[PDB]
A paper describes a structure:
The almost constant ratio between γ-TuSC(13,14)-containing and -lacking intermediates for each assembly step argues for repeated association and dissociation of γ-TuSC(13,14) in an equilibrium reaction. Stable incorporation of the γ-TuSC(13,14) unit, which is likely to repeatedly associate and dissociate over the assembly process, is a two-step process. Collectively, the observed intermediate steps can be arranged into a pathway for modular assembly of the γ-TuRC, in which the 6-spoke intermediate is expanded by successive recruitment of γ-TuSC units on the GCP2(7)-facing side while the γ-TuSC(13,14) unit repeatedly associates and dissociates until it is stabilized in the final step of complex assembly.
Author numbering:
A (entry chain N): 848 to 890
B (entry chain N): 546 to 787
C (entry chain M): 452 to 586, 607 to 663, 674 to 771, 814 to 844, 851 to 872
D (entry chain 1), E (entry chain 2): 3 to 41, 45 to 93, 101 to 177, 180 to 279, 287 to 306, 313 to 447
Write the structure that this text describes.
């Protein structure tokens, strides 16, 4: 259970930093990963 | 351009620099990484380069790399990392393509360094990926034996999708490196070599090719904090195996 | 101008040499230098306009200006409006530009507007101070919206800052009528009966905006387009093309309701009361499905304001200067032909 | 958005087949639907686009007692479509009951085609009034869609049956059909047999195969009304934007049409306008006044003449329309069509709401009321006997068409400021 | 590693023969297996490499009541293979018992082929559900391998029998077969007869030799799914790396497929993606949501469009999948194939776990339960009578497929956080 919560914690910590990186190259990774629309709806 | 491209085979070198180092080939690399596995699990202090060169040769002979020229397989040979008190072979390994003609005027040594850095990244990634598919391996062997004990169902049901949440993340990352890091730069590289009729334009194209690839991975100086998180995705992988 | 023309072809490749060289002298009574100057200048104009109209051609550029700013191909627009209006409905600093940029490529590449590679200069941008710029800040997607365009160097000589910004400012005025008419049709489908004066008000407003649009489509747009399509096929140099383009741009800017000494405040108050009517009626119907006595009073207020802005608009249009064409539509055996008799 | 076509009945499937052959020959495609290289267009509204660019039409085919549907089946245009939707008397109640029992699987065909579409704009149906098998069945499926979807539009192109009066229950059937048309549909485009008979006898000398040439004229009309959709325009490329101006009122939603050449085998904007002002160039036969008129022109037009023309059109007062309020003519331009010989260069199409069609309704009302006074003309067929034992739906339809004709005759008045 | 192919049954040996002819024509080799000089590739997974480069396939051939196996025997591709492994009712229990008595020497054939391999990755079998001779026998050998080797994978490509219902014990046989499939196999790829019937009737006009064209489409699919193996890629060149992402759970391991051209006789990444989003380009027929989708593309692609496309694919929300957790689509690229004409340049293949297939299982469950309520449809054949005197294996299979359908319907829910 702690491992699961840590995994959810580390992935949103990726995306919140990914929001301001680069205009084409790095931003696109955020849109590969979320196609399921509960990412950043747990925020 | 004629005498450099037929007498020293300069075009086949760049094609094989993308193939083996930059992972454009890959029965060869999967067979290398499969056959090199029990050595690299042990620390590299008890390993030397001749023990790599042999198994590399058998990797080359059995796979599709055999019907490629003996020169360019000969110019690629094994290398290691000089030792440190926490040596793993997965920490300590490299390939070296070294210069054997006038191609040093085309390929600088720091260009081989950036080559080896992105090689280090795409090594750590397919490293964790094979650990990941061994996790899925433990899943489809053990779960069909655990029908006969009903009480463990909840925790095994839980661990499966903690694993599947990782296996998807690697099934985005291996596919982000496929569609953006080795066709884009490769298309524009291929264009501005094969249309160009001056050596310096080919040189300046290969340079910015590898350099924008550096920015496109998280191997830049400013994206390093991004990199730092990504290393934390690799901890919970090996933790999960235990 | 003769030597000036040679640079702007030499800047984009091939400095071209003269077909024959003569030595020029002054001699008493003998103006043989004059015809040599005209022959060299004429060759300069010939090879320059022979450079422009094939490489970095102007024709597909004019077609792709008529396509979006003048609105020729708008299948793209009924793709775009329907799939983006709910995101456009949010005020400024609640929308983000990647969202609308992706929706723009959505509507472009779905659509039949796929015919030429100069559809990909198109980007969405805004005007921060919409009409004060002519001599919003709280809304965007309702009163701030534009299309962006990039240029090449031979097309930078004909079209520049001024032409592109007039294109943005005519597109904006055209955007107003596009939005109100689709609001009115969306209200029309809401009833496919008792209180029914709102149906008459809706019909009056929608017939009015169609009178305005087909007035503007067939008085300003296509006439000056075809006269431009005559002037550009008899041009002698690039200053001739420049004169024809500037006259065309002046005519399509002058001929609408973009040029007015007050910018026609009556027109703004009239589209305001139309938007207000659409909003409260859809609000009232959705609060009825889930009084027609107070609603009748509000419809009276809207009808009075609409009739007042209408009579101000006919009086201020009849004083202008072929301008009566919306009025020579509107009053056929006569309604809104005169309501308050003066004297 | 996207528009789904429907076709049923013998005349409806005939005119649908002619419409699809018209758009096959009109655009650059094969009779199996392969794009021609030599041809750009949007055909995404009435045809689903495939990977080899097979523009398979959005045409659901329903048949009952098939004879001509078999001839549609074996055709060189039977490779254009195959959506697998073909599923099997001359009375209104008969076709109503036959549609009633199979409403579920044809509704599955409807929902399958709806899932084929991403978005939707409207349903067109090919139907003929009092066509026998089409009549009653078409009213039933109109009821089914009007129950199911209040979010969409229905456009209907149907003819008025006049065979210059063996079938005597035809006014009853047409009356019940038009009752469902006024109350369950949003916009109706109606035509006459007699006006097309006049234009056909004028342009040509045929009398017996008149149906075939009628099909040609219907195809030209249906292409013309859709040209701003199929050729990319920039206004009223939704159906509802076209329909919105002509209909202020939910019962008077009947639209009459015209088209400038009678024979099609310069013309100026003045000439084609005044030709279009004639009722002999209109394909439907106190003073009557239009509520609103719409015109779309397609040809080689000069843009400066058109403002001259509508100036002088105001000046001569060659139209006489005054409903009560400021609703006038709307003139529009569409592309002159390539990929076909452009002879008879400029051609116009005309769309209005005019009160005179009520008189033609009244003619049918005069017939039906006469038969209703005698009450010997239902012939006691068992279908109408099951469906209504007391035959009170005919009286309800009579009171509805009475309301309709009274709304028409009040709509003529310049006191229609209220009850509009 | 190396993958050993298995084939049995009439439909399985048919599709295996078509697969080997497909890879014969696809790569540069002779029909006796001699390499062509004019041709580089790896064919070491499904073919053993010889000294004159005879790529003899890893195909073990088992036959029972051979008619078409004889036609496979005398062929110009009968010089490609000869591993000397050919060894001789329409019931599940019949094929089960016939495999039971010869399990030893066919296991000797298995172990001989295993010794032919140095390493191993997986076993594929060519099988058809309720195929008669294949049914029961295939479940038995699945039991034999699952008992013998827990170290390997099994991939299975098999069709769902629908002949639009003389054979009434077919739901029982398919039910018992799928019971062994859920519990003794790790990943299943299933297809429909009806969806291939739809695509075949759309792309062509054939009805009677439909099997042959079905074989062609199966061969194209089986080449496509293996292209990253046969043409050297650099990721998921093991089977388990491909399988790992799609299956989180050991009972819901059924994978459905799609392929972008229906007819194969530019396309952009946006076009082929949205085509692949259709169920009419998918060869298998509450809201249902995918768990995870995988796509592999092969063609002339531009690498910068693909990130644009998945941006806009997020933006339009043209897919609707939400299992409960962060498992999304995976897009990949493989080589556009040389040594054949590359027409219809870009083509995609699609692999997902979707819950909707449960409904199709439920349809079969509805049939079987109905027959189980009547209990007159085993026909009292002696084979099922010996193998189970009390017929309680059918009830055990019923409770297992009940658990499976309940796992499916819970897997739709966004509370599948537990029991996953």
């Amino acid at each position: 259970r702690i491992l699961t919560h840590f995994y959810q914690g580390i992935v949103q910590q990726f995306l919140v930093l990914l929001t301001t990186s680069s205009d084409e190259s790095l931003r696109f990774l955020s849109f590969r990963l979320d196609f399921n629309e509960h990412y950043k709806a747990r925020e | 351009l004629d005498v450099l491209n037929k007498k020293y085979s300069l075009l086949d070198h760049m094609q094989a620099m993308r193939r083996y180092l930059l992972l454009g080939q890959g029965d060869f690399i999967r067979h290398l990484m499969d056959l090199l596995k029990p050595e690299l699990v042990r620390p590299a202090t008890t390993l030397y380069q001749h023990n790599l060169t042999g198994i590399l040769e058998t990797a080359v002979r059995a796979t599709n790399a055999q019907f490629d020229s003996p020169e360019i397989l000969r110019r690629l040979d094994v290398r290691l990392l000089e030792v440190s008190p926490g040596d793993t072979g997965w920490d300590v390994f490299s390939l070296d393509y070294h210069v054997d003609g006038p191609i040093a005027t085309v390929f600088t040594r720091e260009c081989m360094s950036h080559y080896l850095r992105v090689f280090n990244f795409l090594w750590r990634a397919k490293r964790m990926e094979y650990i990941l598919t061994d996790i899925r391996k433990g899943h489809m062997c053990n779960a069909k034996l655990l029908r006969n004990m009903p009480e463990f169902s909840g925790v095994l049901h839980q661990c499966h999708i903690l694993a599947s949440e990782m296996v998807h993340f690697i099934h985005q990352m291996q596919y982000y490196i496929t569609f953006e890091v080795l066709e884009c730069s490769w298309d524009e590289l291929w264009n501005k070599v094969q249309q160009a009729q001056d050596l310096d334009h080919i040189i300046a194209a290969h340079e910015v090719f590898l350099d924008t690839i550096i920015s496109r991975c998280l191997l830049d100086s400013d994206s390093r904090a991004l990199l730092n998180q990504l290393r934390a995705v690799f901890d919970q992988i090996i933790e999960l195996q235990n | 101008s003769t030597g000036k023309y040679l640079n702007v072809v030499r800047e984009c490749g091939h400095d071209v040499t003269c077909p024959v060289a003569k030595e020029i002298i002054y001699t008493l009574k003998e103006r043989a230098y004059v015809e040599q100057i005209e022959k060299a200048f004429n060759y300069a104009s010939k090879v320059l306009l022979d450079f422009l109209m094939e490489e970095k051609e102007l024709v597909a550029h004019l077609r792709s200006i008529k396509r979006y700013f003048l609105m020729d191909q708008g299948d793209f627009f009924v793709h775009f409006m329907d799939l983006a209006e709910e995101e456009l409905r949010k005020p400024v600093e609640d929308i983000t530009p990647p969202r609308l940029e992706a929706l723009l490529e959505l509507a472009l590449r779905m659509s039949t507007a796929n015919t030429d590679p100069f559809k990909d200069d198109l980007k969405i941008d805004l005007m921060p101070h919409d009409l004060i710029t002519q001599l919003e800040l709280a809304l965007s997607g309702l009163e701030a919206f534009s299309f962006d365009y990039i240029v090449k160097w031979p097309l930078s000589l004909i079209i520049n800052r001024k032409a592109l910004t007039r294109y943005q400012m005519l597109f904006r005025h055209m955007f107003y009528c596009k939005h109100v008419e689709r609001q009115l049709c969306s209200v029309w489908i809401s009833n496919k009966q008792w209180f029914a004066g709102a149906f008459t008000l809706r019909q009056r407003m929608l017939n009015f905006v169609q009178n305005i649009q087909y007035y503007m489509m067939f008085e300003v747009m296509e006439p000056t387009w075809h006269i431009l399509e005559k002037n550009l096929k008899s041009a002698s140099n690039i200053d001739d093309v420049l004169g024809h383009h500037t006259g065309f741009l002046d005519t399509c800017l002058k001929d609408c309701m973009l040029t007015n000494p007050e910018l026609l405040k009556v027109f703004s108050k009239l589209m305001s009361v139309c938007v207000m009517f659409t909003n409260c009626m859809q609000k009232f119907t959705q609060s009825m499905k889930l009084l027609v006595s107070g609603f009748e009073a509000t419809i009276n207020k809207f009808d009075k304001n609409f009739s007042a802005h209408l009579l101000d608009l006919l009086a201020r249009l009849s004083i202008y200067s072929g301008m009566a064409s919306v009025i020579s539509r509107l009053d056929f055996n006569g309604f809104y032909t005169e309501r308050l008799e003066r004297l | 958005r996207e528009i789904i076509t429907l076709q049923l009945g013998q005349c409806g499937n005939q005119i649908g087949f002619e419409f699809w052959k018209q758009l096959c020959a009109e655009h650059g495609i094969s009779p199996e639907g392969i794009v021609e290289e030599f041809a750009t267009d949007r055909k995404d509204v009435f045809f689903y686009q495939a990977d080899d660019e097979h523009y398979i039409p959005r045409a659901v085919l329903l048949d009952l007692e098939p004879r001509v549907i078999h001839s549609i089946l074996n055709s060189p245009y039977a490779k254009l479509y195959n959506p697998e939707n073909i599923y099997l008397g001359n009375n209104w109640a008969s076709g109503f009951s036959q549609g009633e029992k199979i409403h579920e699987d044809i509704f599955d065909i409807i929902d399958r085609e709806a899932d084929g579409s991403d978005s939707l704009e409207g349903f067109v149906l090919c139907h003929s009034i009092a066509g026998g098998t089409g009549s009653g069945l078409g009213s039933y499926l109109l009821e089914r869609l009007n129950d199911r979807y209040p979010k969409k539009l229905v456009q209907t192109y149907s003819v008025f049956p006049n065979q210059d009066e063996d079938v005597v229950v035809q006014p009853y059937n047409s009356l019940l059909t038009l009752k469902r048309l006024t109350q369950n549909a949003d916009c109706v485009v109606v035509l006459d047999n007699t006006a097309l008979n006049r234009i056909a006898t004028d342009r040509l000398h045929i009398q017996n195969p008149s149906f075939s040439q009628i099909n040609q004229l219907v195809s030209t009309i249906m292409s013309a009304s859709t040209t701003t959709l199929r050729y990319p325009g920039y206004m009223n490329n939704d159906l509802i934007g076209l329909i919105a101006s002509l209909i202020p009122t939910p019962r008077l939603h009947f639209l009459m049409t015209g088209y400038t050449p009678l024979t099609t085998d310069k013309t100026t904007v003045l000439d084609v306008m005044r030709r279009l002002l004639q009722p002999k160039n209109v394909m439907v036969s106190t003073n009557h006044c239009y509520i609103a008129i719409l015109n779309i022109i397609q040809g080689e037009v000069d843009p400066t003449q058109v403002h001259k023309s509508l100036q002088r059109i105001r000046e001569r007062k060659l139209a006489n329309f005054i409903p009560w309020g400021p609703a006038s003519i709307q003139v529009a331009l569409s592309r002159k069509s390539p990929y076909l010989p452009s002879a008879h260069r400029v051609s116009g199409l005309m769309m209005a709401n005019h009160t005179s069609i009520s008189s033609l309704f009244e003619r049918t009302c005069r017939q039906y009321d006469k038969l209703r006074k005698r009450e010997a003309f239902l012939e006691q067929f068992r279908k109408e006997d099951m469906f209504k034992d007391n035959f009170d739906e005919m009286d309800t339809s009579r009171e509805i068409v009475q309301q309709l004709i009274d709304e028409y005759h009040a709509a003529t008045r310049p006191d229609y400021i209220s009850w509009g």
